[PDB]
Structure 1
């Protein structure tokens, strides 16, 4: 019509900008200069808008997109209105089935590069040269809830990476913990049904805190290992940038000489590991159910590209049987103290999608998509997965041509004798649709395996045994890995695990199920079991108190790589601070605060009791990002209250509650000058407290001290003190 504002302010800057500074936008508009081979290959299907006429799908220009055709301006709508019917038809058919699991997920484009050639252990082309760059598309997800459920639920997270290599798509489809719940794929519908909403009423969404889950767990101790991980703060990551990734299964690397090496895949977050606390996570599902999705997108728009290091645990074929646990058992992890992770390469996620539906929702990842240089093993969970991903994609994406949906296409050549199916895009000119043929001189042709550009040939593993439906006896140990995990956690991590079990079991309506789980905990660790029992009003029996603890794992009592926090890795870049304003802020404080944060790549949001602007002591006009209620402390990592007319907000219950919530969730707080008046709301003593930064002004060491706390993520020593505060 001519509907935009004259200043051009409807349009975000096509340049990196902090979160909240500009409206977010399709990736190709936001970052037009950020390219890779896959992103370039999608140009053929990207559709613009500006300066084009509005048409039907058939290209007929529409004159009046405001009205149906009727007989009289108050008359009945006419069936001949093809423009109305095409328009409503498309709308009526917008939806496709969501993924059966991991329906909720958020995705981005990036690139991967190896640090050195891995030719000695694998002929995989994408790992053959440090100068070889592989486009990726990554989706992170929750597990149980639908595509419209909340982000910060307690759940395992999915971490799936599509590598568009020169010799084929390799999908690495992993999670954020190094084991899974179950051993054999045949049980996946039972486990998933147990954790998903219960079938009579479809409650609860996004939660394992209900009877059927804990019933199944109580009857299937193989689940306890991943359940320990889920109940720990691992189940509630601060963001996808701050969690680990794992392939879980042992796979094989195959080199040019035909040697097989056992491998488990790791992703290490270069930003470090960090999680929420449960009360914060749960509240955040209400205040911002899109928190992780938003955080991912805005990090990328800001330039805080999520980076991950790919690492391999490598085990020689001759060492297959050298551990207390079976390598093929996906409920067991391989302790880094026994087998180190060797760094392999770096993955950087640097561009958001243009259209979430077209790129994210239709993306299809499947762990059967491997490339020469890789192979499978007989892990019975993996073995069944290979069937499932292909099968489910045929309904979810509407037939067997899902690889022609643009996000899914290989960047490399694909030719074969497959034809037809729904939505077929490729128009084949081969005279032949079969081989062997003479009529096209047998093209396209098979290719023998070889060191590079060769055909896929399976590693010739020996198979010997009878056709059985039987769990290997080597898989029948359930408690030592849970115990190993438990003992590796810090005291505050352990408390969080106790609290997770305690909260979940309290939602289980049938008391005998709670009892049964507590009994299982008593096989893992008596201290764990006692603390959970106490929280449930349950008394362990003398028999339970006497259950002997499970054996160590190959002589390991603990392994600190299993803790989120035991070995600090605190990166502050990309984190965010709430600044609580008043109507006459000390402009000197604000210059110091904002500049110090910017120097470390830490973002800020200026909050007030209303939107608009406030004016500082010296006339500086300050734009307000959000209100105290609008952007609660849940959404930030720390809080700073500069000096000024504090009486303006000391009376504001919202401002006080802001600090009390941030205090309760162990976040750093800094109070400059008269802001120290807020000490009383949070019961801070005159002399002070570790984790509260206070000075006459925001000058000197004030910002370094606050940033030091932010590097340590949360203020764990504050835990005994929070029990009392009413928040």
Structure 2
């Protein structure tokens, strides 16, 4: 038997912190985490222990190591059907990837409302705080393929499939409140501009190339979302620490048929956090799977991703009360003007069993709505409704994609549709048409009603001529970019400047860089000058004189647009690196781990080799990774305990670890003889805000460290890092 004697091949079916166990399929890791959808998939789950290895036709295989041949050095025979079936299935494993958002990571969970929303919507899943709705959520980047890197600079997707009792509702959102373009007809133009360029298929996962900036320079409607992407919004720390948005005005419809305009929000209960550019970029090389891994391991540990669903609600008579159009998906609704009402909480608590069967084949589409919701004339949403059905015909192989297990509704579904490739449902209805007499007209239409009624569109009045024309009310491109800019902290502003500067420096055609700088001058002169300076461009006199755009309905900023202006940090689920030596002061480590456990903060013990070291009191300490195998990129903070510091004091890797963490603004804590390391990061004897240091790892030492971690990064350090060679 091949498994080890000691059983150490199988991970414990109990929550465990990151790195403590091998990761596993969700039904094996957490067999007792259930919801109606996870239970309904049981008909298709297939186990393996104690079963014979067979063909797909149920024939037991005796020898799965050899082909059939004429003599043991002879040719392979065509009658080897076991070989051909095995190689045939392999040869056909791949299906097309998503046109956009091909890179994504997914998990099962549940949603439950905080109260009944029947006053504003008849959506059944929102009708009672007792209604638990299973969900399957997929987070994604946009540009890169399914095998591209996670921590790229990109917009992120945030798609939630609600398995309601009245149908699938898919809320297919992103991590910013707007989009780059106004009309769906231009989606292929924008996406081709951002994607790798067609001659040579470069670059992967990056907007940092001529065609994207060419389009942006020619299409100023893009500038608002571009501001978001160039901010640290474009490089989230974790899918758990980003906001989500429904992108468009939708409608809620109540039992009396009153329509309310709505935009959707997801608020991360773990707070808002992002990386810094150098750290993100480097992370794409050290671990291109960082966000996929971090999501999976958060769920395995019990650090379930939690989000509060939020609605901004605008009465139908208020349609024209703002100085932007509610239907323009390049415009956000400032929360200072229309606050977000907190409506329910979603918790992701189980990973899938098979990534390809559940994640890669999942089909989300924003036209999948239920009674109680409805669309608006947003010209981007309008065209989306065509695309998300049509694309599945090639991607998932035909019109029966709703029969693929993950996609199936848990609500009943019956109708007169038949056949199509890989038809699973065997219909017994004598009729495949209605009206019919031969089955007494079943399944039958249902009138719209307050509950369990059929779907009827809100009877919006439509008046105008058939035209291909952009609404004049959409023709304003700079005021929202400016509101966003003015709402960021001074360090968030610096990072926006750096992001534009870095991307534009990668644009080979200089006139494109010049044209983008001219657009920036229409938004904010200080921004435009700082970018221009980094590109060796000088603003002309006309550019210095462009009048700024107006404020947004009297607003000159909204702190809700900042990641960091209002404190929101949560340390539970973060990770610290602890750099060991060959004789650690055990009293430091006891206290460190103690205080980290009490706040739910994880640890990785790192050294110059694998195996174990032994502490001063004989405690054996297992090593998780080397300094080079688990770089500071992958942690939120670094602690160096006392002991034999001579062992690591002249380790290039150990020194670099602290330099890299220092450069990336992370909290560093140093006890006793670890303060010798201050010299590698140029810290004055008197100390520095963001460096914790004491004789030992006592109680106050860990409090100060955990305080820094709640504030995410040490922004005050930014002017010191320019001089550090890391």
The alignment's TM-score, normalised by the length of structure 2, stands at 1.00
User: Which residue in 2 is equivalent to 1:487?
Assistant: 486
After TM superposition, give the deviation of residue 153 of structure 1 in Å: 0.2
User: Which residue in 2 is equivalent to 1:590?
Assistant: 589
SS at match of 1:71: coil
The 1-side partners of 2:620 and 2:72 are apart by 52
After TM superposition, give the deviation of residue 305 of structure 1 in Å: 0.1
Does residue 631 of the first structure (1) align with residue 619 of the second (2)? no
User: Which residue in 2 is equivalent to 1:393?
Assistant: 392
The 2-side partners of 1:555 and 1:724 are apart by 42
**Contact 2:431-2:438 at 8 Å conserved across structures:** yes
User: Which residue in 1 is equivalent to 2:409?
Assistant: 410
The 1-side partners of 2:648 and 2:593 are apart by 21
The 1-side partners of 2:570 and 2:45 are apart by 36
The 2-side partners of 1:400 and 1:248 are apart by 27
The 2-side partners of 1:567 and 1:599 are apart by 25
Could you report, residue by residue, the CA deviation over 1:544-570 in whole angstroms, capped at 9, with x for unpaired residues? Answer: 000000000000000000000000101
After TM superposition, give the deviation of residue 533 of structure 1 in Å: 0.1
Could you report, residue by residue, the CA deviation over 1:609-661 in whole angstroms, capped at 9, with x for unpaired residues? Answer: 00000000000000000000000000000000000000000000000000000
After TM superposition, give the deviation of residue 601 of structure 1 in Å: 0.3
User: Which residue in 1 is equivalent to 2:678?
Assistant: 679
The 2-side partners of 1:368 and 1:425 are apart by 24
**Contact 2:636-2:712 at 8 Å conserved across structures:** yes
Structure 1 segments (4+ residues) deviating >3 Å: none
**Contact 2:14-2:29 at 8 Å conserved across structures:** yes
Could you report, residue by residue, the CA deviation over 1:380-438 in whole angstroms, capped at 9, with x for unpaired residues? Answer: 00000000000001110000000000000000100000000000000000000000000
The 1-side partners of 2:433 and 2:490 are apart by 64
The 1-side partners of 2:699 and 2:608 are apart by 29
The 1-side partners of 2:417 and 2:354 are apart by 30
SS at match of 1:483: helix
Could you report, residue by residue, the CA deviation over 1:298-333 in whole angstroms, capped at 9, with x for unpaired residues? Answer: 000000000000000000000000000000000000
Could you report, residue by residue, the CA deviation over 1:223-272 in whole angstroms, capped at 9, with x for unpaired residues? Answer: 00000000000000000000000001000000000000000000000000
After TM superposition, give the deviation of residue 450 of structure 1 in Å: 0.2
After TM superposition, give the deviation of residue 114 of structure 1 in Å: 0.3
After TM superposition, give the deviation of residue 52 of structure 1 in Å: 0.2
Could you report, residue by residue, the CA deviation over 1:328-371 in whole angstroms, capped at 9, with x for unpaired residues? Answer: 00000000000000000000000000000000000000000000
The 1-side partners of 2:114 and 2:528 are apart by 45
**Contact 2:140-2:156 at 8 Å conserved across structures:** yes
The 1-side partners of 2:423 and 2:602 are apart by 47
The 2-side partners of 1:168 and 1:495 are apart by 46
The 2-side partners of 1:540 and 1:93 are apart by 56
Q: Where does 1:54-203 land on structure 2 (aligned, <5 Å)?
A: 54-203=53-202
The 2-side partners of 1:415 and 1:517 are apart by 54
**Contact 2:399-2:421 at 8 Å conserved across structures:** yes
SS at match of 1:478: coil
The 2-side partners of 1:324 and 1:524 are apart by 17
SS at match of 1:465: strand
After TM superposition, give the deviation of residue 662 of structure 1 in Å: 0.1
SS at match of 2:384: helix
The 2-side partners of 1:157 and 1:724 are apart by 33
**Contact 2:608-2:627 at 8 Å conserved across structures:** yes
Q: CA RMSD in A?
A: 0.2
SS at match of 1:89: helix
After TM superposition, give the deviation of residue 708 of structure 1 in Å: 0.2
SS at match of 1:154: coil
After TM superposition, give the deviation of residue 467 of structure 1 in Å: 0.1
The 2-side partners of 1:253 and 1:369 are apart by 14
Could you report, residue by residue, the CA deviation over 1:575-610 in whole angstroms, capped at 9, with x for unpaired residues? Answer: 000000000000000000011101100000000000
User: Which residue in 2 is equivalent to 1:265?
Assistant: 264
The alignment's TM-score, normalised by the length of structure 1, stands at 1.00
After TM superposition, give the deviation of residue 706 of structure 1 in Å: 0.2
The 2-side partners of 1:696 and 1:504 are apart by 45
Could you report, residue by residue, the CA deviation over 1:266-287 in whole angstroms, capped at 9, with x for unpaired residues? Answer: 0000000000000000000000
SS at match of 2:709: helix
The 1-side partners of 2:181 and 2:535 are apart by 27
After TM superposition, give the deviation of residue 447 of structure 1 in Å: 0.1
User: Which residue in 1 is equivalent to 2:315?
Assistant: 316
The 1-side partners of 2:232 and 2:320 are apart by 32
Q: Where does 1:494-643 land on structure 2 (aligned, <5 Å)?
A: 494-643=493-642
The 2-side partners of 1:14 and 1:647 are apart by 41
The 2-side partners of 1:714 and 1:120 are apart by 43
**Long gaps (5+) in structure 1:** none
After TM superposition, give the deviation of residue 88 of structure 1 in Å: 0.1
Could you report, residue by residue, the CA deviation over 1:421-468 in whole angstroms, capped at 9, with x for unpaired residues? Answer: 000000000000000000000000000000000000000000000000
After TM superposition, give the deviation of residue 700 of structure 1 in Å: 2.6
After TM superposition, give the deviation of residue 685 of structure 1 in Å: 0.3
Could you report, residue by residue, the CA deviation over 1:104-146 in whole angstroms, capped at 9, with x for unpaired residues? Answer: 0000000000000000000000000000000000000000000
The 1-side partners of 2:571 and 2:235 are apart by 19
The 2-side partners of 1:512 and 1:591 are apart by 60
SS at match of 1:70: coil
In the alignment of these two chains, the number of paired residues is 726
User: Which residue in 2 is equivalent to 1:715?
Assistant: 714
**Contact 2:501-2:531 at 8 Å conserved across structures:** yes
Could you report, residue by residue, the CA deviation over 1:665-698 in whole angstroms, capped at 9, with x for unpaired residues? Answer: 0000000000000000000000100000000000
User: Which residue in 2 is equivalent to 1:379?
Assistant: 378
After TM superposition, give the deviation of residue 151 of structure 1 in Å: 0.1
**Long gaps (5+) in structure 2:** none
After TM superposition, give the deviation of residue 213 of structure 1 in Å: 0.0
**Contact 2:242-2:268 at 8 Å conserved across structures:** yes
Q: Where does 1:236-385 land on structure 2 (aligned, <5 Å)?
A: 236-385=235-384
The 1-side partners of 2:504 and 2:708 are apart by 34
The 2-side partners of 1:650 and 1:462 are apart by 75
After TM superposition, give the deviation of residue 90 of structure 1 in Å: 0.2
**Contact 2:158-2:244 at 8 Å conserved across structures:** yes
SS at match of 1:650: coil
**Contact 2:591-2:699 at 8 Å conserved across structures:** no
The 1-side partners of 2:89 and 2:211 are apart by 39
After TM superposition, give the deviation of residue 150 of structure 1 in Å: 0.1
SS at match of 2:446: coil
The 1-side partners of 2:549 and 2:285 are apart by 40
The 1-side partners of 2:169 and 2:618 are apart by 58
SS at match of 1:530: helix
